[PDB]
Symmetry: C6
Subunit: 218 residues, 6 copies
C-alpha cells in the first residue's frame, strides 16, 4: 500500500503478513456474509491495484464467486474506457500516461505506474477506483449467497421479539448488501406474531424501534 513517511511524502510499503492473514481468516470463517465487505474495505486501506489482486488471490475456495467478480470488474473497466478514452501521442513531461481500465485493474500496468498515478499531484487514485469496482462485484456476491428472503423471515410462536428483529435486519443486510424506511418498517410489523403485532399497531405512528421492543418485552 501507499503510506506517509517522515518527510510528509507518500511512499510504497509492502503489504504486511498480518493484513494478509486477517483477510484470509475472515473469508474462511465468514464466507461472504455482508460484514465481510467493510472488513475488506478496511484491510485494503491505501492499497494499490497490485495489493487488491493479492488479497483476492489468497481466496482459495469460492471460485464461482471469484469468476463473477472478474466479470463485474471487466464490465466496470469497459465503462471506464468509454467515459475516459486514452488519447494517442507522447506523454507530457512530468506527467503519467492515461490509465485504461486494465491499468486500474492491475493487469496491464506495473507497480511503479500505479505508484505514479497514486502519488501524482493531483493524484489519479487508481487504488480507490479499482476498489469501488471490487466492492460492486462483492455486493452482488453477498446477495446471491443470501439464503433466506426478507419476506421469508417471520416471527415464531414463543420467540422473543428482539430475536425476530435480529434475524430480520441481518437478512435485510444481506438482501441489500449493507445498503441503507417505512417499507421495511411495515414488513417488520406484518411478519410478527399476533400477540406483539396487536400491541405494535397500538403504539401509534412512527414509533421508534426502542419503543417497539419495550412494548413487546414480555
Amino acid at each position: 500500500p501507499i503510506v506517509q513517511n517522515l518527510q510528509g511524502q507518500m511512499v510504497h510499503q509492502c503489504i504486511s503478513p498480518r493484513t494478509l492473514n486477517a483477510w484470509v481468516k475472515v473469508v474462511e470463517e465468514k464466507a461472504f456474509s455482508p460484514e465481510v465487505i467493510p472488513m475488506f474495505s478496511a484491510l485494503s486501506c491505501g492499497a494499490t491495484p497490485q495489493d487488491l489482486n493479492t488479497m483476492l488471490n489468497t481466496v482459495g475456495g469460492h471460485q464461482a464467486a471469484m469468476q463473477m467478480l472478474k466479470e463485474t470488474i471487466n464490465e466496470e473497466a469497459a465503462e471506464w474506457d468509454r467515459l475516459h478514452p486514452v488519447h494517442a501521442g507522447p506523454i507530457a513531461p512530468g506527467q503519467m500516461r492515461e490509465p485504461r481500465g486494465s491499468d486500474i485493474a492491475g493487469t496491464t500496468s506495473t507497480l511503479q505506474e500505479q505508484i505514479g498515478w497514486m502519488t501524482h499531484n493531483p493524484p489519479i487514485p487508481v487504488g480507490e477506483i479499482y476498489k469501488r469496482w471490487i466492492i460492486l462485484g462483492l455486493n452482488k456476491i453477498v446477495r446471491m449467497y443470501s439464503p433466506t428472503s426478507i419476506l421469508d423471515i417471520r416471527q415464531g410462536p414463543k420467540e422473543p421479539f428482539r430475536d425476530y428483529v435480529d434475524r430480520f435486519y441481518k437478512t435485510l443486510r444481506a438482501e441489500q448488501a449493507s445498503q441503507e424506511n417505512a417499507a421495511t418498517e411495515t414488513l417488520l410489523v406484518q411478519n410478527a406474531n399476533p400477540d406483539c403485532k396487536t400491541i405494535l399497531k397500538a403504539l401509534g405512528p412512527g414509533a421508534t424501534l426502542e419503543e417497539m421492543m419495550t412494548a413487546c418485552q414480555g
Copy 2:
C-alpha cells in the same frame, strides 16, 4: 485514525488489523456488557467518522441493537442541524464548509473532508462528536441487554458477600451507564438485600459504614 507524526503533524493512518480484530473479539466475547463501551472508546481513539462506521460494520450479529443504534444517531444528527445550521454560500479560501449532521455521521462526507475538519486550526472534532453520539446509543443497548433490575439482586443464603456485591454493582453499572453516582439510598439497598446472616452483622456495625468495613465484617 488521525495520529501525531514524528514531525508533530496530525496525519491520517489506516485502521490497524489488530484494532479491528480486538473490537470484533470484544463484541463476540462480552456482547454488550457495560465495560464494552470504554473498550470501544479506547480502541477508537482518534478515529474519523469513517473509522467509527468501520468498527460498527464489523459487528455481525446484534442487528436489532445496531438498528436501534442508527436511530439514536439520527436523532442526535437532527439535533446538531437545529443548533448549527449551515450558512449557505461559497466557502472562504483555506476554510472548511460547515458540517451538518450527516457529515459528522460519515454518510454525506468524504474521508478527505473529515481529515480537513479534524486537523483544522482550530479543529472541528467530527470524530469526537460522532463518538459521543455512538456512546449515547450504546448506553441504551447496554441497559436493554441488562434486564435484571437492581431491586432483584439478592444475596443467596450461602452466597459469599463479595460475590453478591459484585453482581450488585455490575448490575448498577449497566443501569447507570457507568456514570459516577454517590447516593446513600443505593448503599442502603445493598444492605437491605443481603442474606439474613450478613444482614445481622451489617446492622451490628452501625450506619454509615464504608464498603471495605462491610466486606471485612461478612468475610466469614
Copy 3:
C-alpha cells in the same frame, strides 16, 4: 499516555490495544494477587488520569473491588484539597483540585498541559499513587488467610510451606517477627532442625537443612 517524540518533545498517544488487552487479561486470570499491582503500574507507564480511568473502566468483573477503589480515591482526593487548596497567568495553567487529579472535572487538554508544563505537575503519577493505595487494600482483602494461620503440614515440603508463608506475607504487607513466626509454624520435625541451626541463619541455610 505521554511519551517521547524523537524531537525530545512530549506528545500524547493513544493506549494501544496490546496494553488494553494485557491489563484485561491480567485481572481475569490473576484477580488481585499481589503481583497484579506492579503489573498495573508497569502497564500504566506515563499515564494521564484519563488513561488510568480507561484501564479501570475496562475491568468487567470485580465491581465490589472497584467501588472500594473509588471510596479510597475520594478520601485521598479530599486530603489533597486540604494540603493544596480564578485567574490564570498567560502561558501557565490552573492549580489542580482532587477531582482534577482523578479526571472527573478535568479534560485531556488540561491534563496534558499539567504533565508537559515547564514546571511539571504529574497529575497522572499523583492519581496512580491514589489508585495503588486502593489496590493495596483490595489485595489485603482478597488474601484468604492470615500470616498467623500459615503452618507447615506434617508431610509438606519446607519449600512449599515457605512459598505459602511469603505469598501470604506479601498480600498482608501490601523483620524478626516474621522470622520467628516462620520457624514457629514449621512442622515439629523441621522445627527442631531450625532451632538446631542456631539464630541468624539465612533462608538458604534453613531450606537446605529442612530438605530431608
Copy 4:
C-alpha cells in the same frame, strides 16, 4: 529486503520473524494449492536473492517439489546465461544467489538503472512453483462434471478451482463451452436456452433450483 526507509532511501532490512513464520505456516496448511503462489509473492516483497533462498530453505517437507524447483531455476539460469553472453552484469548463478554476495545483490538492485536480481529470481521461482501446482493438481478440467443432484454453484466452484490449478492462474471460449458441456442434462438445457454470451451471474440465477 530492500525497502523504502523513512528518509526516502532504499536500505537493507533483516527478514522479519513474522514473515518467515507466515511463510512456513502457509506451506504447512495449503501445501501447493494455487493460492500459495500469490502468498509467496506477497511475503517476498522487495526480497534479495538471499532472502528468497532463506524462504525456500524454511520449507521442511515437500523435498521432491523443492528439487524440481531447483531444476527449473537451473534451466532459467542457463537460459539467462545464453541470452546475456560475455559494469559486470549478473550471471544466472548470481541471480539465484549461489555465486553472489549480499553486497553484490544490493549493488545490482540499487544501481541506476537498477538490475532487479530479486525480482528476476522471484520470477523464476514463481515459474517453478507454477509447474508444481500444475503437477500436484488431482484432476483434469475435462473430468469435472456436474453431479445429478449437485447444485450448479458447487459445480462451478469445482470447475474453476480445478481450472486455476490446471492453467496455473493464467473468459476463454473453450472454458465457457466446457462448463456448459459438462453440466447435468437439466441445467445444460436451461443454459443453452439463455443463448450465447450469457454472464455467469445469469447462468447461476437460472440454474439456482
Copy 5:
C-alpha cells in the same frame, strides 16, 4: 529501559507489555530451569533498577525463591558499600540506590547517562543473576551422580539428561571429570564401546559409537 533515540541521545522508554508477558510466561512454564536466567538477562537488556524490580515483582509464586533473592541482593549491596566507602562532585550511589530501594528513576537515569556513567542497572542485574544462580542450583532435583543410563535407554537421551542435570547443578558455568562420570554411568553395552574408543574422544564420536 534506556534506549537510543535517532537524535543520538539516550532516552528512557516504558517497558513493553510484550516484554512483561514474555517474562511472566517464562517463569510460569519453566520455573527456575537454568535457561530462565539467560532469558531474564536478554529480556532486561537496557533495564533501569526500577525496570528490574518490575520484572521481579511480576513473579506470582516462588516466593521462597524471591525472599532468597532479596537476601542475596542485600548481601551484595552490603559488600558494594564496604568496597565503596570538590565543587560539583556527583553523589555516588549506595547499595540501596543501585537496588532501587532508595533512589528515584530520575537519579537512576542520572547515573546511567552520566559522563562517565555508572551502570546501576547492569550492576543490579549482576546481583540478581547471582541470586538467580543460587535458586537454580537449589531447585535442581537430581544430583549428577544419580544420572544413569537405562538398560534400554538410547545413549543420546542419557547424555541429554546428564548435561541438563549438570547445567542446573552448576547454574550454567563451565572437564574430563565430567567425561569420566558420563562413561562410568553408561549402561554396560555402551560403556564397553566407550572404553574401546580410548581416551580423548569427542562427544560426537561417543554418540556415533553408541547408536546401534
Copy 6:
C-alpha cells in the same frame, strides 16, 4: 543485533522478545530437522557474539547437541588462533573473543563497526552453523542408502523421503541411487525413460 539508524550509522539494538521466542519455538517444534539451520541464520541477522550466545543459552533441552556445539566452537576458535598468530594499530580478536567468552559487548561492537569491519558476529555464526550441521547429520535417523521405495509407496512419497534424508546428510551419484532403490515396477519405467530425464519426467512416468 547491529542495525542502522536514520543517520547512516550502525547502532546496537537489544535482541527482541519476538525473535527470542521464535527461536525457542523453532527448536521445540522442529528439533534438529535440516531447516532449523537456515531458520537460525535468519533469526540471528546482524547478531553480536553476545546475541548468539543468548540464542543458544535459551535452548532448554538438546544439551547433548549443545555440548557437541561447544566442542565444535572450541575447535574453530583454536584454528583461528593458529591462523592468526601474535606478532595506532587496532587489537585483533582471538578465538575466545569471537565466541564471546573473553570479549565485552563494547569490544564486539568496536570490531563489527570499525572501518574496515572485523565481523566477529558473522565469523562466530559461521562456526555455530558448522556445528549445527554435525548435529543435524547426527539426528538424521536413516542413511541415504537405506531409503527404499515400498512396494505400495507412491513414487512422490519415496522421493520426498529420499531428498529430505539427503538434505540432513549434506549430482549423478544421487540420481543413480534414486533409480536403483525404487521398487521393481517404477524402476522399470525409469530405466526405460533413458538418460537425461528430469525429476519432473520421472515423477510423471511413475505417478500411476
